[PDB]
Amino acid sequence: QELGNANFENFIGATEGFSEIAYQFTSHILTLGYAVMLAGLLYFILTIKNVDKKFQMSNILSAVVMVSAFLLLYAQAQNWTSSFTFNEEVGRYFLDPSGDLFNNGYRYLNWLIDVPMLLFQILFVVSLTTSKFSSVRNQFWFSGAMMIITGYIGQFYEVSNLTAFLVWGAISSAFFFHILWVMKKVINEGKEGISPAGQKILSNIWILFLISWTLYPGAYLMPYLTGVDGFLYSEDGVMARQLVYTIADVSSKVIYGVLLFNLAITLSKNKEL
Amino acid sequence: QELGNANFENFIGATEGFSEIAYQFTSHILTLGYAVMLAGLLYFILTIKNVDKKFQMSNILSAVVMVSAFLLLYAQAQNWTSSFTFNEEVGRYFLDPSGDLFNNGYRYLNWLIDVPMLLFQILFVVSLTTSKFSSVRNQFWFSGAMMIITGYIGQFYEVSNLTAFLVWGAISSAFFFHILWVMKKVINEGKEGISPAGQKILSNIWILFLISWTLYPGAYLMPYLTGVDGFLYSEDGVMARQLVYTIADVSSKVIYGVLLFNLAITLSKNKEL
Amino acid sequence: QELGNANFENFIGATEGFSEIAYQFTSHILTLGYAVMLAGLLYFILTIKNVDKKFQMSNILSAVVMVSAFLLLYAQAQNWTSSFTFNEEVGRYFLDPSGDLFNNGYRYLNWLIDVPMLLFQILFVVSLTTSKFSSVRNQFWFSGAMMIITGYIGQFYEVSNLTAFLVWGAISSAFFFHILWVMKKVINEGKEGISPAGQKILSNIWILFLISWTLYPGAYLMPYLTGVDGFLYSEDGVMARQLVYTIADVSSKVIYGVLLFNLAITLSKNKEL
Amino acid sequence: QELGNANFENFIGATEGFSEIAYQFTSHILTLGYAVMLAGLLYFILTIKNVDKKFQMSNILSAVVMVSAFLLLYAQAQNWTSSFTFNEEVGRYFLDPSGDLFNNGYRYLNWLIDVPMLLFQILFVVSLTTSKFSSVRNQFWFSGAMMIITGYIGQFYEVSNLTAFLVWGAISSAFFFHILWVMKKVINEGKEGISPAGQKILSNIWILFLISWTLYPGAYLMPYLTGVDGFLYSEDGVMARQLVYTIADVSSKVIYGVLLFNLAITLSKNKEL
Amino acid sequence: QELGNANFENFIGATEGFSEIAYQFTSHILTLGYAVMLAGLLYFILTIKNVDKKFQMSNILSAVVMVSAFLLLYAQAQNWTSSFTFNEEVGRYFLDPSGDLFNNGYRYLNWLIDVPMLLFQILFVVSLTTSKFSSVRNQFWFSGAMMIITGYIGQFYEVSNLTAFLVWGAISSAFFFHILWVMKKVINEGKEGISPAGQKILSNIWILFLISWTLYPGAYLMPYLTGVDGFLYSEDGVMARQLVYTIADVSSKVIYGVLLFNLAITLSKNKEL
Numbered sequence A, B, C, D, E: 001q002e003l004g005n006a007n008f009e010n011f012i013g014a015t016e017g018f019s020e021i022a023y024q025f026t027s028h029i030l031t032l033g034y035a036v037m038l039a040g041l042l043y044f045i046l047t048i049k050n051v052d053k054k055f056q057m058s059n060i061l062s063a064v065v066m067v068s069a070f071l072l073l074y075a076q077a078q079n080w081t082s083s084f085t086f087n088e089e090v091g092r093y094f095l096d097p098s099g100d101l102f103n104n105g106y107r108y109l110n111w112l113i114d115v116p117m118l119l120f121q122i123l124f125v126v127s128l129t130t131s132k133f134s135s136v137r138n139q140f141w142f143s144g145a146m147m148i149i150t151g152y153i154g155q156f157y158e159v160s161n162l163t164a165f166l167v168w169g170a171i172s173s174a175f176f177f178h179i180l181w182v183m184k185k186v187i188n189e190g191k192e193g194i195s196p197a198g199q200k201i202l203s204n205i206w207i208l209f210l211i212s213w214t215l216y217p218g219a220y221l222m223p224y225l226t227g228v229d230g231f232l233y234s235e236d237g238v239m240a241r242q243l244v245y246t247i248a249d250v251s252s253k254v255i256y257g258v259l260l261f262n263l264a265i266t267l268s269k270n271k272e273l
Ligand SMILES: CCCCCCCC/C=C/CCCCCCCC(=O)OC[C@H](O)CO
Pocket: B161, B163, B164, B167, B168, B171
C-alpha cells in the first residue's frame, strides 16, 4: 500500500486502524469545532451594534473568520468520517481510500483567510502610536502568507520525508516569530492612552494570542513530540492533533474575537461593561 | 461481533435488531429535536428587541445554544439512519457498520457549548446580591466542563466496562450537584428586588432546570434502570433514551430560554407581556 | 415480504410498485410542499413590521411553524425518493429497503410543534371575553398532544392491525373534537366587539381551520376510504394521501397565517387594510 | 427498456445517450438557473426599502418566487446528474434508473407558487382604472392553476401518448390565452395616469411577459418542433429544452421583478432612479 | 479510453492519475475559493450602510456576485473530489467516471452573472462624463456575453480539437479587448471630478482589473503554455489552472468589490478612510 506524501493519520489508519474511542472522538471534536464557529458567527453579527461605529468592522471581520472556519471544519468533519470505515472482523476503523486520504492541508489554505483577518482586525480597535498602520498590516499579511504556505508544503512530507517536514517547518517558524514580534508591538501601542480596563484586556489578548497560535506548530509536530515510535505516533496522537487544532481554533478565533469585542465596548463612548 | 467500547444501541442493533416502530420512532424524535432547535433559533432572534438592551445578550446566547443543538441533533438524526439498515429476510433494522457505530458522545462534547452558555445567560437577566458574577460564572464553567468530560469518558464503557461506566458517572454527578447548588443560589439572589411576577418565573425556571438537567443522567443510566436483562436493555430502552434526550433538550434549552425571555420582559422598564 | 408495522405505501411499493406518474407526482407534491413553507417563512419574516407590536408574535409563530414544516417536508421528500427505486425489467418503482421503509410518522411528531403553535398564535390577535387565555392555551396544548400521540401510535398499524388503527384513530378523533370545540369558542369571543372586516376574516379563518384540519384524519383513513381492495388501496391512494397532506399543510399553516396577518392589520391602530 | 409515461430525455438517454457537451451543458445551464435565483433573492430583499412602503409587497413576492425557483432548479440540477451516468466503453452518458427517471414535472407543480405570485405582484405597483383588484387576482389565479395542472398531466404523455400530450396542451393553451388577455388589460390600465417613463417600463414588461411566458409552451413542444424524428428529437433537443426553461425562468422571474422594482421607484414619491 | 470533447484534467486523470499533493491541493484551493466568496458575501452585506445610499447598490451587486461564485465554486469543489478516486495499488487518484467527467465550463456559464454585474457595479460608484450609462452598460453586457459564450464553446475542444480551441479562444479575446477598452474609458471618466485619493483607488482598480481578468484566458491556455508535451500538460498544469482561477476569482470579485467599497467611502459625504 503506497500512500505517498500523506498525513500520518492515514498510516495509522491503514496499519493499526482506529478504536471506537479514537475514531468517534476525532469525529466529535471536529463537530464541536464547526458548531462553535457557526454559533460564533451568530454572536458576532448579533452584537455588532453594541459598540461604536468605528469598532464594528472588527465584529464584521470576526464574522468573516467564523464563516471560513465553519465551512472548513464542517468539510473536514465529513472528510474524517469518509476516510475511515469500520472493519467488522477486528472492530476497528481502517483507511477507506474510496473516501480520499485524510489531509490537514485543508486547514492551512483556509488560514490564508483566517490569519490575515485576525491580525488585521485588532487594528480597528486599538490605535497605533509609533507604528504605521499600513506597515503593520503589510508585515502581518506577508509573513502570514509565507508562514502558511511553507507549513503547507511541509506537512505533505510529515511521513514521507522528515527532513523536508522539519526544514519547511523551521522556515515557517521564522515568519511566525516575526508575526509574534509585530503583534506584541501592536498590543503595547494599543495600551497607550486607554483605560486600565482596556489595558487588562489587551494583556489577556496577548497571552491568548501567544498560547493559541503556538498550538498550531504544536499540532504540526504532534506525531513526533514523543520521538520515533513514541506514544503519540499512534491513534492517541491522531486524537491529540485534532484536539489541539480545535482548542487553538476556538481560542484564536472565537475567544480572541470576544476579547476584542469587550475591548471595543470599554473604548466605546456610549457603552459600559 | 467485536464492537469494543460502543454504546448499547449498537449491541441491540447487532443482535436483536430494531422493529419498524423502534427504528422509525428514534428517527422521528431526533428529527423533531433538530426542528425545534431551528425554530427556536428563529424565535430568539426575532424577539431580541422586545426586551431592554441590557437583557438582549440572553436572547443572543439562547440563539447560540440553538445553533449548537440544531447542528448536533441534525447530525445525530443522520447518524441514526446511516447506522442501522433494514434486513428484508427478518424485517428488522440491524447494525450497518459501514455507517459507523452510533455514539451518543456527539451530544456530550457539544454540551461544552450548551452547558456553559445556558448557565451564563441567566446572569444577564437576574442581578446577584452577595455572590460575585465572575465567581458564579467560573464555577459554572469549571464544574460544567468536568461534569461533561467525565460523563463523556464514562459513556464509552456503558457496555464494555460497567464499573468504569458507574465510577466516571459518579464523579460526573458530584460536579452536577455543585452546579445545582450554585444555580439555586443564583435563582434566590435573582428573586431579591424584583416584582412577584418575576419571582414566580424564576421559581418555574428552577423547577424546569432541576428536572430537565436531571433527565441527562437519566439517559446515561437508561439501559440499566430496570437492572440486568431488564425491560430497558432492549429497543424499548433505545427509544426511551432518545425520547428523554429530546425532552431534556427542548426543556433545558428552548423552554428555559423562553422563560428567561419572559422574565426579561417583566424586568423591562417600558415593555410588557 | 416481512414489513411488520409499516405504512401501506411500502406494501403497494413492495407488491405492485409505482408507475412513473405515481412515483414522480408524490415526489413533486412533497417538493412543492417544502418550497411553499420556505417561501412562507420569508413572507412572514418580511411582513412582521406591517402590524402593531402586539400582533407581531403571530408573524413570529407563523415563521416558527414554517421552519418546522419546511424541515419536515424536505426530509420526507428525500425519504420518498430513497425508499422506492426503479426496476428496469418492469418499469416501475419498487420498495428499496436500503433506503428505509417510508413512514408518515415523521409528520406526526413534528405536529408537536405545528399544532400547539398554530392554536396558540390566534390568541395573540383576538381578544377573549369570557374564556381565560392560559386555560384555552392549556386545553389546546393538552388535547393537541394527545390527538397527535394517539394518532401516531395508530398509523403504525394501518396495515398490520386494522383494529388498533381504528381504535387509536377514534381516541385521537375525540381530542380533535375537543380542539374544534375550543377553537370555535375562541373565534366567537374574538368576533365580539371588533370591526366588521375583522369579523369577516375570523369567519373565513374558522371555515379554513375546520376543513384543513379535517383533511389530516382524511389522510389517516385514505387507503380504506374506498373499503377493502378499493380504488384507493393502490398507488392512486398513495398519491391521494400526500396530495391531501400538502393541501392541508398549505391551508392550515400558510393560508391560516396569512389570514391571521390580515386580521392583525385590520385591528392595527397605526395601519390601514 | 420499459419507461412508460416518461419524458423524452429518458428515451434519448436510454438509447443514444448524451455526449460530454450535451450532458455537461444541461448540468451547467440548470446550475446557472438556481444561482441566478438565489442571487435574485438577495437582490430583492436588500432593495425592499428603496421603494415606498406601498410597493414593497412586490419586492417580497419577487423574493417568494426566488425561493421557489431556487429550490426547484437546485433539486432539478441534482436530478439531472443523478439520472445519467457515463459509460466508459463508448464515452457517453446513459439513463441510470437507480437515480430515478428525469421528469420536468417538478417545475410544473412549483409554478403553482411562481405563476400566481408573478401575476399578483404587478397589482401592487400599477393602479387599475376599470378592473377590480380582487377580480383580476381571482382570474389570474384560477386560469393559472388550470393552465399548470392540465399541462402537468399532458407532459407525462409527451412520448407515450402524443394525442393526450397535444389535447391537454391545447386545453392548457386556452387558459394561457385568458391570462395574456387579462395581463394586457392590467398593463394598459397601469399606464393610465403615470409618467411616460413608467409607461415605457410597462411597455417593456409586456414584451418581456409575452415572450418569456410563451417560451414555456415552447419547451413543452420542443422535442417535436422539428417534427417526427427531427433534429430536436435528440440530445440537441434536450439541451434546447433546458436552455429555453432557463432563459424563460430568468426573464419571467428575475428580469420581470427588476422591471417592476424600477417601475415602483419611478412611482415612488421621494426616490430617484 | 474514450472521453470525447472533455477537459484535459480527465485525460491526465485517466492516464497518469494525480499524486496525493496534486489531488489534495486542487481540492484545497477550490475549498478556499468558495470559503472566500461566502465570507465576502457576509462582508458586503454587513458594510452596506457604511456608504451613502447612492453607492449601496454596488455593495448589493458585490453580494450578488458572491452568491454566484460561492454556489459555483462549492459545486466545483464537490465535482473535483467525485471525479477522481484513489487507486490503492499505485497510490494515485484516477478518473472515476461514475462521478462524471470534470469540466471547467461550470465556471463559464456562471460568468453570465459575474461578468455583467462586476462591470455594471462600478457605474454606481463613479460618475461618467461624456459617456452614457446605458451605452456603457449595453456594451459591457453584449461583449461580456459573447466573450463568455465563445470561450465556453472553445474549452470543450481543448484536447479534442486544438484548432477549434484556438479559434473560439481568439474570437473570445476580441470581445475581451473591447471590454478592456470600455472599462479604461470608464476609469478615466470616473477620475474626473473626484479627490486624488479616489483617483489613486481607481488607478489600483484598473491594474487589478487588467491583471485579474487576463488570468482567465491564462487558465484557458494553461495546459499548452509550455507547448506540446510541456511541463504544464500534466498534474502540475491541472494544479496551476485551478490556482490561477482561484487567484483570479478572489481578485476580480472580492478585492475588486473591496476597492470599489473603499472608493464609495471616500466619495461619501459623511464618511472617510
Ligand atoms: C477539583 C478537581 C477534581 C478532579 C477530578 C478528576 C478525577 C480523575 C480521576 C479519575 C480516576 C477514576 C478512574 C476509574 C476507572 C475505573 C477502571 C475500572 O473500573 O476497571 C475495571 C477492571 O478493569 C475490571 O472490571
